[PDB]
Amino acid sequence: DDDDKKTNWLKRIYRVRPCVKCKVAPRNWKVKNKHLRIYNMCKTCFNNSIDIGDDTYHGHVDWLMYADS
Amino acid sequence: DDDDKKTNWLKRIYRVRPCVKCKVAPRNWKVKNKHLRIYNMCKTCFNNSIDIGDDTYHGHVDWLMYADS
Ligand SMILES: Nc1ncnc2c1ncn2[C@@H]1O[C@H](COP(=O)(O)OP(=O)(O)O)[C@@H](O)[C@H]1O
Ligand SMILES: Nc1ncnc2c1ncn2[C@@H]1O[C@H](COP(=O)(O)OP(=O)(O)O)[C@@H](O)[C@H]1O
Ligand SMILES: [Cl-]
Numbered sequence: 001d002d003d004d005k006k007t008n009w010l011k012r013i014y015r016v017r018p019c020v021k022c023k024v025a026p027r028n029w030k031v032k033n034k035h036l037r038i039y040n041m042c043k044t045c046f047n048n049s050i051d052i053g054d055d056t057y058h059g060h061v062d063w064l065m066y067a068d069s
Numbered sequence: 070d071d072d073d074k075k076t077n078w079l080k081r082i083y084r085v086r087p088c089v090k091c092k093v094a095p096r097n098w099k100v101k102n103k104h105l106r107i108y109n110m111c112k113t114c115f116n117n118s119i120d121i122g123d124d125t126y127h128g129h130v131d132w133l134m135y136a137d138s
């Protein structure tokens with residue numbers, strides 16, 4: 001089943017690349033209708049980046065959650 | 070740059086999972102407007118599957134080619 005290839009990929013994509021900033025925590029994310037938005041940082045490091053004034057790691061990658069578009 | 074995280078992922082996704090049927094050739098694919106469609110089989114095994122009457126591996130996974138949806 002093709003939807004499961006996509007789901008297992010997202011599961012892996014999410015797991016093997018932690019927060020770009022602290023490198024250990026997993027990334028923040030949310031579901032935005034038909035896509036999964038994976039933010040570049042965990043929530044702790046994102047808030048911290050505002051405080052310290054660094055917007056270098058700000059960003060996200062959206063992933064279609066289904067196999068067919 | 071976020072578009073590049075998506076591109077490098079697709080590059081990897083495409084490379085580490087060859088044809089589901091013969092297991093060596095890389096998969097067929099095409100660009101369908103804003104998505105990359107990765108078919109489950111290379112072209113040789115897909116045509117062959119019609120000939121032998123097996124539709125078990127028929128299918129594809131579409132991937133949004135950009136970071137933002
Ligand atoms: N945890 C995070 N790590 C990195 N960047 C983030 C994080 N949370 C938000 N951002 C960035 O801040 C902005 C807010 O995004 P978001 O709230 O998803 O947009 P929208 O409100 O349109 O859904 C975007 O640039 C997003 O990439
Ligand atoms: N190389 C291949 N491997 C596996 N399945 C395939 C392959 N080529 C086509 N198919 C399947 O046959 C059908 C034809 O798909 P496609 O021509 O992409 O649709 P469309 O013409 O709407 O763009 C779909 O079920 C597709 O998944
Ligand atoms: Cl996707």
Ligand SMILES: [Zn+2]
Nearest residue numbers: 019022042045
């Ligand atoms: Zn972090």
Ligand SMILES: [Zn+2]
Nearest residue numbers: 088091111114
């Ligand atoms: Zn093959």
